[PDB]
Amino acid sequence: LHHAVIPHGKGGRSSVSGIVATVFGATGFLGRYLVNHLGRMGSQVIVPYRCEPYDTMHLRPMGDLGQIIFMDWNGRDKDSIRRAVEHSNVVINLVGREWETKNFDFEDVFVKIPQAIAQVSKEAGVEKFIHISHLNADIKSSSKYLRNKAVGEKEVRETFPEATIIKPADIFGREDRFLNYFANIRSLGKKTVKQPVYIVDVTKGIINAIKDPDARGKTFAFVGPNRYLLFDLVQYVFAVAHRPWTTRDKVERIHTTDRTLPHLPGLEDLGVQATPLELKAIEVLRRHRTVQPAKTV
Amino acid sequence: TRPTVRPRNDVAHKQLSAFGEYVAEILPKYVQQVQVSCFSELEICIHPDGVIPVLTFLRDHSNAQFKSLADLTAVDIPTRQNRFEIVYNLLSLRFNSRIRVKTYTDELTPVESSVSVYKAANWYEREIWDMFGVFFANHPDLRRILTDYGFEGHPFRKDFPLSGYVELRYDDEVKRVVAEPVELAQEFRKFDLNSPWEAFPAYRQPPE
Amino acid sequence: TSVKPIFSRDMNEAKRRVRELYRAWYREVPNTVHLFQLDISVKQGRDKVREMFKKNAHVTDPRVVDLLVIKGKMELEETINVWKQRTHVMRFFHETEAPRPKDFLSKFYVGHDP
Amino acid sequence: TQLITVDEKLDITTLTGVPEEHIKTRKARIFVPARNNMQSGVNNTKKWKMEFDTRERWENPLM
Amino acid sequence: TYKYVNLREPSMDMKSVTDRAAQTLLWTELIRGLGMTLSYLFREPATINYPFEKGPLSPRFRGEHALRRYPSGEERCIACKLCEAVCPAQAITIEAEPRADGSRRTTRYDIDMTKCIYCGFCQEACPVDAIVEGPNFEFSTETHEELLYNKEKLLNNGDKWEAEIAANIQADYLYR
Amino acid sequence: GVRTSPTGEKVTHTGQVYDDEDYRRVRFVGRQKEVNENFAIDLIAEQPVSQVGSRVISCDGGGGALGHPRVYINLDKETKTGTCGYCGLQFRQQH
Amino acid sequence: SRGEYVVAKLDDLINWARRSSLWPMTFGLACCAVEMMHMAAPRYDMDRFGVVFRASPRQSDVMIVAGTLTNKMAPALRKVYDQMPEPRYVVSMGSCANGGGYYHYSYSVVRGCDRIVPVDIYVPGCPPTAEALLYGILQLQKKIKREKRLRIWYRR
Amino acid sequence: SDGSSRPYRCKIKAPGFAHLAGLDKMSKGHMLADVVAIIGTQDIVFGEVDR
Ligand SMILES: NC(=O)C1=CN([C@@H]2O[C@H](COP(=O)(O)OP(=O)(O)OC[C@H]3O[C@@H](n4cnc5c(N)ncnc54)[C@H](OP(=O)(O)O)[C@@H]3O)[C@@H](O)[C@H]2O)C=CC1
Ligand code: SF4
């Protein structure tokens, strides 16, 4: 343990937590929340960004001076990844897009990029690697999203033996795409069961997995405290919002039930209390305003 | 003595001493000490229980006419049991004079408000509360005026540190500015600048 | 030992003023929650009010609790009108603060703070 | 009479606004400071001083 | 020794009353204001063409801090810590040790330009004219840490601006 | 003349080089480490030694009021040249 | 190819359009606001740069934090910044909004306005001279001039 | 002054602090658009008012 990485302080903004974390794709939603949680305890965060620097502007007040280092990177440029991760002691992978594009399809964003990041981090001698996948990721799924997630997480686990794979079920928050997708529809009802998990709980679970040394090589499953049927969930969403972009893959994903994985550790094994939807739905959907809770199975 | 020393005034010293004797002999109930400084300033140290009459006398006597209120200053001296020194500064326009009235008050005991004498103090002592915690009884509207709304404690007390106990920073998770414990990037370097040698022989305290 | 009182002559009048201040705060809490479109429930805010009232409950000097009654009444009056923002109301709920270690073992692990 | 006989303990810990962590885990020290041995002056050793124990100060990671 | 402004009693005769009525109806003072605005339309404006033109400044101008050198190549500062003691904002941090040849020199001379108030106490307290509030003012930065100067940035500033700081101090030192 | 530590990072005139295991070098990648190419000890190492004929010499750094305060240097010891404490110049007696 | 050249031309067109009409929101807090008003004098004349004087905070493009940002004003400044439409830029006048400056160790002063809002251009001084803020505004215009929004959008 | 080289207490009296204290009496019976002139006629600068 080097002297510059030994923690000090009282865990405040100006303290030292001794974490050198490279967060890939930190300009998104989960990346923004992870950078906010990492910067408040006094950690060194290295953010490789592909978009405009202005879109990274909101990442500046997340920490103290010099604790967030923005640098350019490219998905198919291995040397940029070697540049980014050769000084960090933990790498977090959050790269993912909900829809395919002309330059980056689902395979190149879910298979090639995570495997390349893991291989580069393995060659650079990093200590802790975290890869974010989906809970319902299966090889034999009907949609491309879960297929590519399953293949990518298999390749990541094969490439890095100590890779901690984190599987959120479905995440709701201020800048999410689950409750904001439902409330803005003004697809249909089915028999699917889902158990959403609060974004702050996922971020705290990731941070608690960073802190402990016993979580290396595991495969967690971040699921919410209560399971909801889709019809009651969308009725609750429309009732909170005081109301009377899409693709085929999202349509398939909405009509897929959330699987149960009892053999894998969850949020309670990391000391995280799963916040229910009824305590945060008002905060999430107060923007849409110009109530009985949903029934749980 | 002539070129580089400020000249001394003696007729103003005599007139201020005469008026101090006149005040001390005209209100023996509340006056405790009367002093005239070297630079011709008169200070009257009186009891707190006469905060209202004495100043009212200076507001309404024919020979005083201290119509204007200049200052309302609180001085915190922790080594006394009455650690707060409330000081009024009065200005008389007819006779063109300045006077200083001093009283002592600790944390818990209140002092009667001087709003009915000078209305300007209706703001001034309000700030005193917001800086010292000295309660002013029968004040019309006494609340904080300078510090933050959620501020705990009083800053100008000598046991209060220079930097506060909380700092404000914006958090995106709660989408709000929030208070956190203070953690400075650089500690305020305390400079030991007191000379170990005696400076003024005429100001020497007697030994214990 | 004889002192000048502020508002209350003895402990009973200070207790009565404590009761009246708590009654006014309990009346205000739902209106404060609704006015600032707060994220908390009514019972959580009343629990916070009770927690402050019982945290500041180990002092028996009538002048001290009289001054605390006056300061709480200033807080109540500031919440009567729209003088505070959402931040000043939410400051009482230490939500963004990381929970400090309390037991001896975790305090030994994190540093030298007793 | 306008005077009340109070024999209670003079405690204003709840009026100063200090958090509890800095009124129970701190050690106040009342002492007369020692004369600086490189000087013969003793004017700084005439008043009692109140000080607090030094807590943790670390190095800034940036600079 | 006192003059009564706004204590001019208006004339009550027919001439002044009729003239005031004509002023009220015909807007004569408004016509005077229009004439003044027309006269001030045609004057040449005082707009200097920045950055191709620069404002008038004095040799005593206080700007970016810099560390000077002797006319032999050696750094002027002797780590006497007067500037960090006189600094009202405590922007100057000095850490020193005796170097290889035994000379008393600095190892860390940090000026926090975001803390500094540009008061010039360091440039007058310095007994060897090492630190100077130089003439540069166009050094706005895009990042906060670029305004946190170490010893190397100040020495580079001194090496960059010595050719004009020496002339300014030569023109100014007889007033000090 | 500066040196080069074998991590690729330049050496300051103080002697401060980040180690191979120091993460703070991530603040330099994509940017540059600003150092001074004119070392003060090397710049004064090429100054000649002034030979005078007086036991006590006086130095003020040149220019009068634009130099350091005037200091007197004794040159009795012929083993070591008398070096000024402010400007670093050294004087030698001919005898 | 055709697409990259076309989006580059459109990018520099909209970039010139945005950088040539920067409408500010002046925060009249302290000394540096008076220095801003003296930069608005006929000698320096911001208005020839396409920069209007004293625009409403609901239509402004840039905000100049001139003065000390205390604890009692930070929620108001954050509310004003959140109300101002995208794209929004922040220019920091003085040492007060840079790092607190004189009042860095005061109990009720926010140590830099970077802790409340993202800050693009830091202008040093106490107060910075009027031509120094003019150079900072020109630096902000050059920072806008090299923006690559449409090229990144086409590449993504 | 306490005898050392530092001031014990230095109160700043503002001319505009007492001038703003009379603002409640200043604008009694006037229109809401007159306070931009009642503030104007008193040289009120918010530096020395708030210290
Ligand atoms: N729906 C959900 O919330 C869930 C998400 N996950 C997984 O969590 C991760 C994070 O999700 P989320 O925050 O919602 O995603 P976002 O779409 O919000 O953010 C993705 C981030 O990665 C970058 N990025 C995306 N595609 C590429 C690419 N081809 N090359 C380079 N950079 C790229 C984006 O850059 P830019 O700034 O240009 O947009 C952005 O910074 C993903 O891997 C996702 O699959 C898991 C479970 C549930
Ligand atoms: S100009 Fe004044 S405030 Fe700035 S570094 Fe020098 S002494 Fe300090």
Ligand code: SF4
């Ligand atoms: S006052 Fe001058 S010689 Fe002394 S430490 Fe400062 S810069 Fe160096």
Ligand code: SF4
């Ligand atoms: S930086 Fe200086 S000039 Fe500007 S507001 Fe602060 S004290 Fe005033």
Ligand SMILES: [Zn+2]
């Ligand atoms: Zn010399």
